[PDB]
Structure formats: C-alpha cells, structure tokens
Design a protein around this nucleic acid. Structure first.
Ligand SMILES: [Mg+2]
Ligand SMILES: [Mg+2]
Ligand SMILES: [Mg+2]
Ligand SMILES: [Mg+2]
Ligand SMILES: [Mg+2]
Ligand SMILES: [Mg+2]
Ligand SMILES: [Mg+2]
Ligand SMILES: [Zn+2]
Lengths: 95, 202, 128, 119, 70, 76, 214
RNA sequence: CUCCGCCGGCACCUUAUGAGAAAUCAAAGUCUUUGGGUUCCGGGGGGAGUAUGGUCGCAAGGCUGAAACUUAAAGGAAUUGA
C-alpha cells in the first residue's frame, strides 16, 4: 500500500535533492523530506527578562533574538513530538 | 404609460441588492453572469433572474395540492422568508436543520413525500438536495454565482447571501404564484408588504 | 501519430455519451464523410457541415441522441460476402439492428447493401 | 457527581410544558405541586424532578430556553413576528448603481429606469 | 464572439494575429509599410531614422512614429 | 417491440430523457418529470401544462438547469 | 394488517393500481413489500445460498448468516434480496422482503424471427459485480439456457427460455455472481433500440393523477 | 506591482457521469458495447538468477540462462479483533 501521494517528500520534476544532516543524530535525510523549523527565540525567557532589562546600561537596549533553522530526520521529529502520527484523513492536511 | 410588472420587479430586486453576486463563478452559473467588475464580483442578469422566476412560478402553480411542496432554508436569514412564503402560498415550510432521512426513511416520524422542493441555497441545503436524488423530487433553488448545480432542476440566479435579497425573492415568488392562481387579480394591487419577509434580529 | 476515422468516431462516442449536441472533427477525409453518410441514411445522426478554412479540413456533426457505440476496425481485414455473417455476430448486438461498414470497389456501404449487391471488401467500422 | 439523568430531565421539561402557570420558583411549593399532578414511585425521584424544575423556571423567568414550548411566549414571538413598519424600508426612489449595473440595464432595454443613477 | 481570444490556430477558421502597418516618422512624412512583428531594425530610406525595434513579440516603434493598420 | 402478427409484446415502453434521449429505467430514482403550466389570460392558469423528463445522468452532471432552460424555449 | 406508510401504499390499498408497470414507468421507489404482493399474484421465492460470516471479538467470533433469495414470476419480473441476521430463518425472511422490494422488469426479445412469444434477451447484454462479469447473448429458440446453476436459476425466474451465457472472474463468489446476473437482467431495458426511437408521450405521475384523494 | 487572455512546463485541490480486487487514479477514464500505432516483458510458490555453455571485464563481476527435484498454496487490497 502507498501511504502518501507525495511519497513522503516534496520532489516533482527533479531527479536528485541534496541531503542534510539531522540536528539531533546527524542522519542523512534529503532536504525536501526533512522536518524544517525556523526558531526565532529570545535570549532569555520572560521570567528572567526584567532582571536583565534593569541591568541594561543603555536606555532602549533591545535584547537580541537567536534565529536558527533546525532540520530533523523523520525519526527524531516523531520522537521529539515535533510532528505526530495523525489519522488517515488528517494526514492530507498541509495547514 | 406606467411601468410594467417586469420593470417594477427589476427596480425592487435592484434595490434589494439581488443583482450583486460574489467574487467567483461556477461554470454552470456562468450562463447567468453578465460581467465582472474591478472589485472582482460578478453582476447577475436580472432579466434572466426574472425569466427563471417566471419559470419557477409556473412550475409551482401547477401543483394541484400545495401541501405537496416543501420549502426550506438552513441559513438564519431565510427563516422568516420561507415561513411567510409557506403561509401565503400554502406550502410546508421547514426552517433550520434538516433531519437526515426525512425523504428516504419511511418509518421516521418526520417523513414526507414532497412533489416539489425549494431551497434558499444549494450550498448550505445540500442534505435535502442529496436526499431528493433518491425520491424523484424535482427541485428549485436560489443559486448564487458560486452555487453547485448538481441535482437542481430550476435555478434562480441571485445573491442569496443578503438579508433583503432573500426576502424580496421569496416575496416576489409568492406574488407570481398568487397571480397565476388568480387570488391576486390583474392589476398590481397586492397588500402584503415586502418588509414581512426580511428577518428580525432579536 | 495519426490514423483518422478513429479519432472521428471516438470523438463522436465521447460527445454522444456526454449528451452534447454538436461534435467537431478536426481532420476530415472522404472516407469519414462517406461513413457519416451511411450513419445519416440509417438514421443515427442529424445533418453535418464541412468547414474548409483551407487544410485537411474540419466538420461539425449534429447528434440525435440515438447512437450507442460507433467504432473502427483498424487493421481493416479483408472481408468477403460469405464471412459477413460471422463478423456481424462477433460485432453487432443482435441480428435485428446495427451495421458494419465495408469499403468496396462499389463505394463505402453497409453490410446489408453489400449482401444485396453481392460484393465484399474491407471492414472499416461499425455503429449501433 | 450530581448530573441528572434522562428521566428527571425529560420529566422536568415535560411538566414545565403542561403547567407553566401553576409552578413557581420555590422548591417546596413546587414539590407539592408536582405531587398534585403526577404519579412517581419514590420521594427521592420527586425531590430530584422538582429541583430540576425550579431552576428551569428560574432561567425561564430569566429568558428563553430550548425545546419546551411555552404558549405565552410562542404567540408573543408570533404576535411581533407578523410585524409591519409604517411603510416599506425597501424603496425604489434613491437606488444608486455602478457602471456595469446601468450597462446591464441598457442591455435589457430598461436604460431609462426611474430612480437609478450612478454612484 | 469570443474567437478573438482563442489561440491563432484553434479558431474555427485559422487566421493570423499580425498586421502590416503604414508608419510615419517626423522628419520625413513619407509612409513606410512595416510588419507588426518585425525581426529587423528597419530605417526609412529618406530620413535614415531608426524606425522600429525587434522584440519577442510585436516590434517596438520609436518615439512619435504614427502608424495605421492596413 | 411488435410480434410479427401485429401484436405488441413489450410491456411498459419506457420514457426517454428529453435532453439526452437516454432511457429512464425503472430503478433510476434521480430522474424527475416536470409539468410547467400554461398561462393564457384572465386567471393566468388552467390545467394546461407541458411535461419534460430528466434522467439521473443529466441531473447529476448539473446540466439539468441549462437543459431545462433550453427546452422551455419552444414556442406554441 | 398493513396500514401503509407511503402514498404508493395507500393507492395500492385502495386498489387503483393493477400491475407494476405504472410504477416502473415513473421510476418510483417501492418501499413496502405488500405493494408487490398485491400487484404480482403468483410471485415465487427461493433461497439460493446461506453463507456464514464472522466478526472477530475479544470473547470470540460472532457468527451471522447471510441469505440470498431470488424471487420472480416466470413472466418477466425478477428481484434479488440479500440479508444478514443472527439466525437463518429471520435472515431468510428479510431476504424475501428485500427481494420483493427489488423486483425489476426484464424485456424479452427474439433471436431471428418475431414469431410467437418472446424467448431470449433482446440483444447482447453484460453485467458486473466485483470481479464477476456475466454476458448474455441471444440464442435460437429451443436452445435452452447455457449457464451455470446460479445464473440459470435467476434466468428461470425471469421467464427467459433461450440464452447463451459467458462469464469471467471469481464466479465461486456466489454473492457477486448472482448480483452480476441480476444487474445484467435489470439493464435489458436501458438499451436504446430503434423501436424505442418514437418520441415519448408523457403521462401524469401517480402522485399527480391521484392528487385530490391524497 | 495589479487585472484579463493564449500557448508550454512542474504540480496541486474538489468531484463521478468513469475505471478498478480495492487502496486509489482526471488519466490507472473513453473494455465482453472487447481493434489508433509501436517496442520490451509475465504465466502458482520454490529450486534460482543457481548449474552449465557463450560473451564482456585486470578483478570484483556484468549480460545470456536451465534441469532434476520439491510443494498446496505463496501472494495483493481491505475489514473486525488482539
Ligand atoms: Mg507498512
Ligand atoms: Mg523538467
Ligand atoms: Mg535517484
Ligand atoms: Mg498554464
Ligand atoms: Mg500457468
Ligand atoms: Mg512460475
Ligand atoms: Mg496486509
Ligand atoms: Zn535524527
């Protein structure tokens, strides 16, 4: 049986897509198949923002954010709850 | 001279924003759109709306026992319409949710064998449409320019998504039914006002 | 990649099965027109028109709603006046109606006129 | 867990429908009234049905409610549902349209139509 | 009719979309016959002005050069 | 259809769809038969109507509306 | 008794319907079996197969019996009913009532010459259910029914006398074999033959003739 | 950048009037109502891509490719349970 119509990856009109290394285990997974998330997270969470905001010398200092684009293989993404097993019908939902 | 009945209906339907469609057009509803504006919304040929209203009226009037007609609206704006339409023409209104099995389940207490079925909108009243195809029931529907036309025989093209349009269309169907039945004599004097058909928001 | 009288007849079956009233055949020929004449004379299509812009041609056919299936026997076999019977048993729904079209040195004609005029030929198609 | 089951809830509504006038908002008098109109097989069933009817009356006296059909409010929601204004708010005098609307009206031959003008 | 929107070869009777036009510059009011999809840089014999430009579609006329379909 | 001795041996010659000429079978429950009434003069209705039959094929394509529209435009 | 629950049932109880062909002409859904049992006096039923089906559960396997019942007067009406129940007798009873509800007309024809009473199928006809396809071809008179036991019983209840049958697929699946045969019979009336070319003169539907009574 | 249209691509969404054992498929449709043209290729599971002969390769190996014997199922899709 064929689980998905796209074969589990986003490849049409190509023959080959370069792979990437999983951020957790370093497994080689093609770029169009890996689970890619762009995380824009703060330098410190809100319980500890103010005791740094009061220790800023400059007025108007904005604490940077860290930006990282994290790839996961299917196994690590499933195990880390980034993606979940869905039902047959809700598998088709790309939203 | 004065205005003919067709001209007066055109005036009223144009006042009730019946002519004003939606952004999209179903291809089977394309035989009724006149043109599309820079807004993106289509304008409906009201002359063809009136012609279909005549055809629908002549189909409705030929029913020897009006209690064999079921009128129906799943939307909240079409309750008060389909009730008064049923009360002046003598048909059977059912407003709100439709109970699946009303037309195909004989052992249901809510079970009817309608000779005709009228629908505010093919999109929201899709359950009675599907149930009709199992009971040889012809159907008349008010179809916007995005209405699916599967299993609908007579479609009146109109904006069915507005408060004044639904009321004025049902008022105007009722008027022709009464005229052809002869209860309204020749001469436009009919005393029931179109404000009866718009719904009331508590 | 073209061998017409298959595209024409199959376009007609598809159009008739969808209930269309007009069908358009892009590449025409005398063979197609001669076939369509048999169709009309036996009653299965309405009148049709040749539109010549210049080229191979073009025709539009008026469908009467009474044809059920019309197809070609490509690989046109050689067909003598004695094995007409067995082709029509293999290919027609009954002994009562349906026609097999054969090209013969006496023109293109149906199998019954072929029996009467006692000529064989090569099979082109059928319709019923 | 004090969820009332089907029998109590059904009987509560169905006794609200039959006698709205003779019930009231006190539990105890409602107990007595419910003892004077229906045949129940336990005191606990009566106390439970009367308890569910008393706050059903509190919310009825508050506003509207589901399936129970009270007569004094089904006609009052009809007496004002066949309600008419002084004259019809849909008027054909000032009905302004945009280019393509008079374009279609010229298509039909009703190019001159009393009360139509551009935006 | 909506054939004018259809493809050049998919009409009931096939027809071209191009035209020959009578073009007129400013410094020499003679009239030159040129083809809507030129493919060549063309100069009028008298005035020696560059007259149109080859593109991927219809040729681009130069500044202030009237033309008439004909 | 007809026996060779003149007799008619079929039972129940079926109706045919007025748009596509397909047969409306006994078990085709998506077909309908419309009777549209004739308005003549004062009163504007007597028991005079013209009848059109539509099979489940047409009704399921959606083309019932266009077909009915075009079949009502016949003048008498 | 009956006390019918449908307009057709009422009209049949008052006796304003004599055969089933005025219900066939209008494609009406027949929802009560008594409508058949009045309009068809001599309808014969027969059980063709009883099949046990099972569903697996934690406690064990729950068995149910499915019955296949062909009914028909041998004069051009057949019906097929299938019913699953916990007990063979009630499965059979439900299968009879469903088979009566499913009664369909079958048109008969002549192989070569229109002498006498019609004996074969009019023309080549096919039917499919699942993987099973059944073909029925006109046969000369007196040639018998060349078919396996299942389609032979179905055709016998149809009143067809001579026919050449061919089949393909898993005919050992009796369910699909019998339903393919029934489906083949039911579409003998859906083929457009030149004797059906005559334009139709429509008749008022039974809901519309008997308007005043209802 | 916005709107409309026509060719040509990679695809996608909704739907049977279709097909299919189904999963599914707008081509896997236009098939017992079976025929547009053409090339390759299958015939229960194993034995076995094995033995042997030929051929190509430095080699690893590639292509071509059996038989004896054995066996009543192996297998596909879907359902209910565990
Ligand atoms: Mg798996
Ligand atoms: Mg490419
Ligand atoms: Mg690769
Ligand atoms: Mg494109
Ligand atoms: Mg074999
Ligand atoms: Mg083998
Ligand atoms: Mg499996
Ligand atoms: Zn990983």
């Amino acid at each position: 049986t064929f689980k998905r119509r796209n074969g589990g990856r986003n490849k049409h009109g190509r023959g080959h897509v370069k792979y990437i290394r999983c951020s957790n285990c370093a497994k080689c997974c093609p770029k169009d198949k890996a689970i890619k998330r762009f995380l824009v997270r703060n330098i410190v969470e809100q319980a500890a923002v103010r005791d740094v905001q009061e220790a800023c010398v400059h007025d108007g200092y904005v604490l940077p954010k860290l930006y990282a684009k994290v790839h996961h293989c299917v196994s690590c993404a499933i195990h880390a709850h980034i993606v979940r097993v869905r039902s047959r019908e809700n598998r088709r939902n790309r939203e | 001279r004065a205005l003919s009945q067709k001209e007066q209906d055109i005036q009223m339907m144009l006042a009730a924003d019946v002519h004003l469609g939606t952004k999209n057009c179903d291809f089977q509803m394309e035989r009724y759109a006149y043109k599309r504006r820079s807004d993106g919304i289509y304008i409906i040929n009201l002359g063809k709306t009136w012609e279909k209203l005549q055809l629908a009226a002549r189909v409705i009037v030929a029913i020897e026992n009006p209690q064999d007609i079921i009128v129906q609206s799943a939307r909240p704006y079409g309750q008060r319409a389909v009730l008064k339409f049923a009360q002046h023409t003598g048909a059977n209104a059912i407003a709100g949710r439709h109970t699946p099995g009303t037309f195909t389940n004989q052992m249901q207490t809510s079970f009817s064998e309608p000779r005709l079925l009228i629908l505010t909108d093919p999109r929201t009243d899709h359950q009675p449409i599907k149930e009709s195809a199992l009971g040889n029931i012809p159907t008349i529907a008010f179809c916007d320019t995005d209405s699916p036309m599967r299993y609908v025989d007579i479609g009146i093209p109109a904006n069915n998504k507005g408060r004044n349009s639904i009321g004025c269309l049902y008022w105007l169907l009722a008027r022709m039914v009464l005229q052809m039945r002869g209860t309204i004599l020749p001469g436009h004097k009919w005393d029931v006002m179109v404000d009866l058909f718009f719904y009331r928001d508590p | 990649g073209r061998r017409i009288l298959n595209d024409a007849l199959r376009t007609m079956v598809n159009a008739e099965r969808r209930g269309k009233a007009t069908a358009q055949l892009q590449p025409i020929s005398g063979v197609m027109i001669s076939f369509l004449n048999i169709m009309k004379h036996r009653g299965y299509i309405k009148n049709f028109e040749v539109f010549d812009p210049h080229r191979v041609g073009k025709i539009t056919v008026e469908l009467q709603g009474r044809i059920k299936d019309c197809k070609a026997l490509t690989y046109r076999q050689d067909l003598r006046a004695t094995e007409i019977e067995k082709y029509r048993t293999r290919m027609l729904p009954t002994r009562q109606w349906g026609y097999v079209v054969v090209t013969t040195p006496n023109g293109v004609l149906d199998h019954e006129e072929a029996i009467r005029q006692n000529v064989g030929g090569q099979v082109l198609g059928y319709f019923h | 867990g004090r969820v009332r089951t089907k029998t109590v809830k059904k009987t509560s509504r169905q006794v609200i429908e039959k006698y709205y006038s003779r019930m009231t908002l006190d539990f105890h008098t409602n107990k007595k009234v419910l003892e004077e109109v229906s045949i129940l097989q336990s005191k606990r069933l009566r106390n439970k049905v009367a308890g569910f009817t008393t706050h059903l009356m509190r919310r009825i006296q508050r506003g509207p409610v589901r399936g129970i059909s009270l007569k004094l409010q089904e006609e009052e929601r009809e007496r004002r549902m066949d309600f008419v204004p002084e004259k019809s708010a849909l008027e054909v005098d000032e009905i302004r349209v945009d280019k393509e609307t008079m374009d279609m009206l010229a298509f039909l031959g009703m190019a001159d139509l009393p009360g139509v003008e551009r935006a | 009719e909506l054939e004018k929107l259809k493809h050049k070869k998919k009409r009931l009777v096939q027809s071209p979309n191009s035209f020959f036009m009578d073009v007129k510059c400013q410094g020499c009011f003679n009239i030159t016959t040129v083809f809507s999809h030129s493919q060549t840089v063309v100069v009028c014999p008298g005035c020696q002005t560059v007259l149109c430009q080859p593109t991927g579609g219809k040729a681009r006329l130069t500044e202030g050069c009237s033309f008439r379909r004909k | 259809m007809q026996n060779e001795v003149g007799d008619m041996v079929d039972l129940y010659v079926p109706r045919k769809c007025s748009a596509t000429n397909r047969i409306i079978t006994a078990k085709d429950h998506a077909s309908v038969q419309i009777n549209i009434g004739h308005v003549d003069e004062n009163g504007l209705y007597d028991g005079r109507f013209t009848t059109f039959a539509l099979s489940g094929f047409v009704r399921a394509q959606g083309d019932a509306d266009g077909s009915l529209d075009r079949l009502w435009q016949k003048r008498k | 008794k009956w006390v019918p629950v449908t307009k057709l049932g009422r009209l049949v109880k008052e006796g304003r319907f004599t055969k089933m062909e005025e219900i066939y002409l209008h494609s009406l859904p027949v929802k009560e079996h008594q409508i058949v049992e009045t309009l068809c006096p001599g309808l014969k039923d027969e059980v063709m197969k009883i099949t046990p089906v099972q569903k697996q559960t934690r406690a064990g396997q729950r068995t149910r019996f499915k019955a296949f019942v062909v009914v028909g007067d041998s004069n051009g009406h057949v019906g097929l009913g299938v019913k699953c129940a916990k007990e063979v007798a009630t499965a059979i009873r439900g299968a009879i009532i469903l088979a009566k509800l499913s009664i369909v007309p079958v048109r008969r024809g002549y192989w070569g010459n229109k002498i006498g009473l019609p004996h074969t199928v009019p023309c080549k006809v096919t039917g499919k259910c699942g993987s099973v396809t059944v073909r029925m071809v006109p046969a000369p008179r007196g040639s018998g029914i060349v078919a396996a036991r299942v389609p032979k019983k179905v055709l016998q209840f149809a009143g067809i006398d001579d026919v050449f049958t061919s089949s393909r697929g898993s005919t050992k699946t009796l369910g699909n074999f019998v339903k393919a045969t029934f489906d083949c019979l039911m579409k003998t009336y859906g083929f457009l033959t030149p004797d059906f070319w005559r334009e139709t003169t429509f008749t008022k539907a039974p809901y519309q003739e008997f308007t005043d009574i209802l």
